[PDB]
Design a binder for this molecule. Structure first.
Ligand SMILES: NC(=O)C1=CN([C@@H]2O[C@H](COP(=O)(O)OP(=O)(O)OC[C@H]3O[C@@H](n4cnc5c(N)ncnc54)[C@H](OP(=O)(O)O)[C@@H]3O)[C@@H](O)[C@H]2O)C=CC1
Ligand SMILES: NC(=O)C1=CN([C@@H]2O[C@H](COP(=O)(O)OP(=O)(O)OC[C@H]3O[C@@H](n4cnc5c(N)ncnc54)[C@H](OP(=O)(O)O)[C@@H]3O)[C@@H](O)[C@H]2O)C=CC1
Ligand SMILES: Nc1nc(N)c2c(OCCCOc3cccc(F)c3)cccc2n1
Ligand SMILES: Nc1nc(N)c2c(OCCCOc3cccc(F)c3)cccc2n1
Lengths: 515, 518
C-alpha cells in the first residue's frame, strides 16, 4: 500500500543475454594460428601462461571449485587437439562446442573411468557456437559461479568472438606471438582495426606488450605477450576531468586547513545498457557500500546504524553524538541523521522527530510518483525527485551532495540525470556514479523499462590536496572494460530488495594505488 | 522591509562599469595589404567611398536618420583627420572622435573654415589625447554610452595596429575590409588580420561572415575590388547551434496528449562568459530582452502575480495565468494572473504558505537569495550556495512547475560563476531567454556581493525542438554567430529589489534579421 510493487516484467528487464568473456590465443610472426589439428611449435613459457591465466581466480586465496572456478570455451576440434591425458583441462569447466559430440560422448573418450566421473561436472558441450555457449554461461547455474570465461580455441570460434554480437562482450584479448616461422597455420588471427566497420565501434588497444623473450626449451624461440582491451571512453571522461582539475584547478584552502583543487561545472555520460555497470576500473569502488546505502535511500531510511551494522561506515563521522550536537540536533539519538536523503525522497517535507516514528503516508513520495508516471506517460518532463529541501536542511545531520535527479524515456530505455552540488573526485564521484546506475536500473525493473544512460552533472568538482600524487598514479592506468550487474533473484516490492540479490560480475579493477 | 530587502554594497558600481566600448573597424587595402604610403590613399574607388559613408553613418533599423541623441561615432588618428578635406570636415552624421597628443578639441575646431562652421559642429567633434584605447574608454562614458550606437575605427596605420592587438582587439565586433586592385601602388603600411592559432590572434578566430564577388568599379579605369566582413568566431553561441542541430538530426520524436510533437535529446551543458560586461544574448535570432530583464527582476522581487508583467507589455505568462488554465489545474480560488507560489516565491519564501498574491509574505519561508548573498560575501568557497524552486509540496499549488528549478553559485578569483539546472528546455524560444535570465541574475548577484561576473554554465535536461520550429530552426543554423553585446547600468539602487529594467541597457547587439518563414 505504501511500498512500490514490482511489475510482472521485473526480471525480463535485466536478464543477462550473454556472459562477457576474455580470449586467449597464440600466433606466429605471420598472424597464423595452426592448421586444422595441431600447434607444431611448443613454448613452455606460453603453455604455463595459458595454464595460469585460464585457471587462477583473482581472489588470491581461493582454489577453483564447482562453486567458483573459471571456464574455458573451445571448439570440438580444439578439444580433440588436447592430449587425451590433459583432458578435460584441470580446474576449469570445459565447454566444448559441437553439433555432434554430446556431454556423455566427450566424457567417454576418457581412459580411467575414475575421472569419467570426477570429470562429470567438468565437461559440458553445446550444440552451437560461442554465442550459444556465452548464452548458456549467462544462466544462474554458471553466473556468477563461473568467475571468468576464456574462449581458448578454434579459428572458427575466434572469428565469431571477433564479430558482433559476441565482440561487444569481449573483455580482453591475450595474444602470444611465437616468432617461429611456420606455414602450418592457414587461418590468420586479426584483431579488428580501429575505425573500420569490423570493429563495430570498438577500439582495440594494447594494455601491455612485453619485450622479446626466449624460451628455455633449447630452441632460442623468440616470443612475446600482448593484452589488448576495448578502449573505455566513458571511464576516460572521469580521468580527463580529474587530470584537468589537478592541472588547472583552483586551489582553495579550508578553515580547517583542508586543501582542494577544483573547477565548476562538468558533465559525464554512462551506458547502463545490456547489464553494464559503470564501476570504474582504475581504482576499485566499494560496491557493497553503494548497494547497501542506495537500498537504504530507497526505503527512506534515516538511521545510519543500519549501514553500520552492515560494514558500511560511510555515515559514522556525521552520526557521532558530538557532530549531531554541534548541529543542535541534541534530541537525535546517536546515528539518527535526521530527514536526510531517502526521507525527502519518500517523504518530502514530512515533520521529523525521530527515526523511530512511522512515516508511511507522510510527506510527498516523489519516487512512488516517478514510478507511476514512468508507466503511464514516460514522456512527462517533471519526473525528478529532490532531497534539497531548504526548510528541512537545518534538521539534517547534513545537506545532501547528490541533491537532484530527473528521468527520461525514449524507445523503452530509462535514462537518469544526476545533479551533484559538490563532488570529491577521489572517493565520492566513482561511488555516486555507482549509486545512480544502480538506482536507475532498479527504477527501470520497477517500471517495465530497460536501463539506458546515467548523466552526471557536477557542480563543484574537486580533487583533495593530498590526492594529487595518488590520483596521478591512477591517472596513469588505462581504463579497462566495465563489469556487469545481474540479479540472482527478485522481490515483489522495490523496498524489499537486498544486497544479496544482485551480483557484480567480471569486474577486474587494477591494484590499490601503490602509495 | 529593508532588512527584508538586499542592500547593495558600496562597490555596487565598481564591478560592472564598462572600461572599453565595443567597436567595428572599416578599412581599405590594395592586393598586397597596403593601406597607403603614410602620405595618402593613392586610390579612390567610388563604390567603396559610398560603402564607407553609409556603413559609418546609417543606424540599425532604417527609417531613422542620425541625431545628437542617437548617432554612430568614428575614431581616427590626427593625420587621417588632417587628410579629410577641411571642407567636408567633419564627416557628417557621426561623432568625429580624433586621437591627437598635440591638438585639443578646441584646436580641431579652430581648424574649420569659419566661426559658423565651428558652432554647428561643436558637439560633433571631440579630441582624445591618447590611443584607440583611450578613445574607447571615453566612448564608454555615460555621455556616449549607450547614446552612440556603433563605434567605427575609420583609420590610421597607428590606429589599426592598436585596434588589432590586445586589449582593444577583444572589443572588435567586426572588421570591414575592402580590397582594391591598386596597380603598382607599393605603399608601406600593411593591414594584416592575425591568423587562427597564432599568438598575435590572441585566441581570436577571425572568419568571414561575408565576401563579395570580384566587383568592377564603374569609375574610370574599372579598378577591380571586393568586400569582406570578418568577425570573431563565437564558439559559445555555436554551442547552442550545434545542440539544436543535433536535436533535429538525431533527437527523439514525441507527441503528447495535446498532440504537440517535438524532437529531443536528454542531458547537455553549455558555457557562457559574463566577464567584462559581456551578455550572452543570442545573435542568430533576436532575444526578447526587455521581457527577460522584466521577468528576472520579477523573480527576484518574489512576485507571483503575472499581471505586473502584462501591464508592462510582457505576456510570457498570459497563457499560464489565465482563468481557464488556472482552473484546469484546480486553482479555482486563484484570481486571474495569480500564478501562486511559483519561481521567485520559492526563491524568497521557500516553504512559506500561500493564499493570494497580494498577501504579505515578508519574513515568511526561507529567503534563499538573501542567504546566498550573505555567504558569497563572507565564505565565498562554501559548497552549498544554491537556491531551488523545485518544491514538491507547493508544486500542486503553482500554476505549473519551474522549468529553471535550480541554480548554484561558485567563486574563484573574485569572479562569481553560476550553474543552472533546467528540466524542460525549448531550444527555439525557451533556451535563449533563460541563458539571458541567468546571465542577468549572475550579474546582479555579483553586484550585490562585491564580485565580478564570471561564467554561466547551463545544464539542460529534456532539450527539444518543436516540429513547427524544425524548418526555421534550420534556416537559423545557416547563420554564423556574431560577437555578443554588452550590459551597462545607467543607474544603481539601494537595494537589489529596487532595480528596474530602465536602470540598464544592452549595447552593440547586432542580431540577424527575422526569419523568412511565417
Ligand atoms: N596455437 C594456438 O594457440 C591455438 C591453436 N588452435 C588450433 O586450431 C585448430 C582448431 O581450429 P578449427 O579448425 O577452427 O576448429 P575448432 O577447434 O574451432 O572446432 C570447430 C568445430 O567446433 C564445432 N563448432 C564451431 N562452431 C559451431 C557452431 N556454431 N555450432 C555447432 N558446432 C560448432 C564443430 O564441431 P562438430 O563439427 O563436431 O559439430 C566444428 O567443426 C587446431 O589445430 C587447434 O590445435 C586452437 C586454439 C589455439
Ligand atoms: N586606405 C584607407 O582605408 C586608409 C588610409 N589612411 C591613410 O594613412 C595615412 C595616415 O596613417 P598614419 O600616418 O599611421 O596616421 P594616423 O591617421 O594613425 O594618425 C597618427 C596620429 O594619431 C595620433 N595618435 C595615434 N596613436 C596615439 C596615441 N597612442 N597617443 C596619442 N596620439 C596618438 C597622433 O596625433 P599627433 O600627431 O597629434 O601626436 C598621431 O601622430 C594617411 O595618408 C591616410 O590617407 C588612413 C585611414 C584609412
Ligand atoms: N596463448 C595461448 N593460448 C592458447 N589458447 C593456447 C593453446 O590452446 C589450445 C587449446 C588446447 O589446449 C591445450 C592445453 C594443454 C596442452 C595442449 F597440447 C593443448 C595451446 C597451446 C598454447 C596456447 N597459448
Ligand atoms: N574600405 C574603406 N575603409 C575606409 N576606412 C575608408 C575611409 O576611411 C576614412 C578615413 C579617412 O576619411 C576620408 C573621408 C573622406 C575623404 C578622404 F580623403 C578621407 C575613407 C574612404 C574610403 C574607405 N574605404
Amino acid at each position: 500500500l505504501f511500498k512500490i510493487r514490482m511489475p510482472e516484467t521485473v526480471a525480463e528487464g535485466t536478464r543477462l543475454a550473454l556472459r562477457a568473456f576474455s580470449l586467449v590465443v597464440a600466433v606466429d610472426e605471420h598472424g597464423g594460428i595452426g592448421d586444422g589439428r595441431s600447434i607444431p611449435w611448443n613454448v613452455p613459457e606460453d603453455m604455463k601462461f595459458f595454464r595460469d591465466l585460464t585457471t587462477k581466480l583473482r581472489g588470491k586465496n581461493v582454489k577453483p571449485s564447482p562453486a567458483k572456478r573459471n571456464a574455458v570455451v573451445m571448439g570440438r576440434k580444439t578439444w580433440d587437439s588436447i592430449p587425451p591425458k590433459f583432458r578435460p583441462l584441470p580446474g576449469r569447466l570445459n565447454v566444448v562446442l559441437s553439433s555432434t559430440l554430446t556431454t556423455q560422448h566427450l566424457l567417454d573418450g576418457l581412459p580411467d573411468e575414475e575421472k569419467r566421473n570426477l570429470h562429470a561436472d567438468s565437461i559440458v558441450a553445446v550444440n552451437g557456437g560461442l554465442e550459444q555457449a556465452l548464452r548458456l554461461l549467462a544462466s544462474p547455474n554458471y553466473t556468477p559461479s563461473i568467475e571468468t570465461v576464456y574462449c581458448i580455441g578454434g579459428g572458427s570460434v575466434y572469428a565469431e568472438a571477433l564479430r558482433p554480437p559476441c565482440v561487444h562482450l569481449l573483455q580482453a584479448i591475450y595474444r602470444t606471438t611465437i616468432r617461429a616461422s611456420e606455414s602450418s597455420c592457414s587461418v590468420f588471427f586479426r584483431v579488428p582495426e580501429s575505425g573500420t566497420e569490423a570493429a563495430a565501434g570498438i577500439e582495440w588497444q594494447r594494455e601491455t606488450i612485453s619485450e622479446e623473450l626466449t624460451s628455455a626449451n633449447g630452441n632460442e624461440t623468440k616470443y612475446y605477450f600482448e593484452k589488448l582491451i576495448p578502449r573505455n571512453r566513458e571511464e576516460e571522461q572521469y580521468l580527463s576531468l580529474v587530470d584537468r582539475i589537478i592541472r588547472e584547478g583552483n586551489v582553495k584552502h579550508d578553515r580547517t586547513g583542508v586543501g582542494t583543487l577544483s573547477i565548476f561545472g562538468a558533465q559525464m555520460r554512462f551506458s547502463l545498457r545490456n547489464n553494464r555497470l559503470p564501476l570504474l576500473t582504475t581504482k576499485r569502488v566499494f560496491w557493497r557500500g553503494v548497494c547497501e546505502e542506495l537500498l537504504w535511500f530507497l526505503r527512506g531510511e534515516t538511521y545510519a546504524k543500519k549501514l553500520s551494522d552492515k560494514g558500511v561506515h560511510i555515515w559514522d563521522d556525521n552520526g557521532s553524538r558530538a557532530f549531531l550536537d554541534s548541529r543542535g540536533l541534541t534530541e537525535y539519538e546517536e546515528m539518527d541523521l535526521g530527514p536526510v536523503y531517502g526521507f525527502q525522497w519518500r517523504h518530502f517535507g514530512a515533520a521529523y522527530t525521530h527515526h523511530d516514528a512511522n512515516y508511511d503516508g507522510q510527506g510527498v513520495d516523489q519516487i512512488k510518483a516517478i514510478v507511476e508516471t514512468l508507466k503511464t506517460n514516460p514522456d512527462d518532463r517533471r519526473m525528478l525527485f529532490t532531497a534539497w529541501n531548504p526548510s528541512a536542511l537545518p534538521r539534517m545531520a547534513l545537506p545532501p551532495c547528490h541533491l537532484l535527479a530527473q528521468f527520461y524515456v525514449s524507445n523503452g530505455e530509462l535514462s537518469c540525470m544526476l545533479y551533484q552540488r559538490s563532488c570529491d573526485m577521489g572517493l565520492g564521484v566513482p561511488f555516486n556514479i555507482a549509486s545512480y546506475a544502480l538506482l536507475t536500473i532498479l527504477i527501470a525493473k520497477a517500471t517495465g523499462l530497460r536501463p539506458g544512460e546515467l548523466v552526471h552533472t557536477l557542480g563543484d568538482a574537486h580533487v583533495y590536496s593530498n590526492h594529487v600524487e595518488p590520483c596521478n598514479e591512477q591517472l596513469k592506468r588505462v581504463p579497462r572494460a566495465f563489469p556487469y550487474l545481474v540479479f540472482r533473484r527478485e522481490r515483489e516490492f522495490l523496498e524489499d530488495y537486498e544486497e544479496g540479490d544482485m551480483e557484480v560480475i567480471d569486474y577486474a579493477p587494477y591494484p590499490p594505488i601503490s602509495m
